[PDB]
Amino acid sequence: SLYKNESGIQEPEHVPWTASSGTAGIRSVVTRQHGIILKVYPQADSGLRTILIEQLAALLNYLLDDYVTQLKSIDKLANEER
């Protein structure tokens, strides 16, 4: 609400720093993190694994919200293709 201007000027597209473009950002870290998960998971105990699930779900929701924000950032009137 604060960073939304009183009148503003409407232009398409935006990407937050968290969703820093290119997979080499948080996304590759996330992928490697899951690859690391799958090794430890079988021997990890029930509660530890579970907590890993809730944290992972939080992470995934944050990332998909990043994508949703990036999408909504676009104002499409001739940009439907992109």
Partner: peptide
């Protein structure tokens, strides 16, 4: 001037400077 904040060119992608300050 916050209302006049429109855009700037970053990494080849355009970002509103209000959003830039938020970040």
């Amino acid at each position: 001037l916050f209302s006049r904040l429109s855009t700037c060119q970053t990494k080849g992608m355009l970002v509103a400077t209000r959003l830039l300050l938020s970040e």
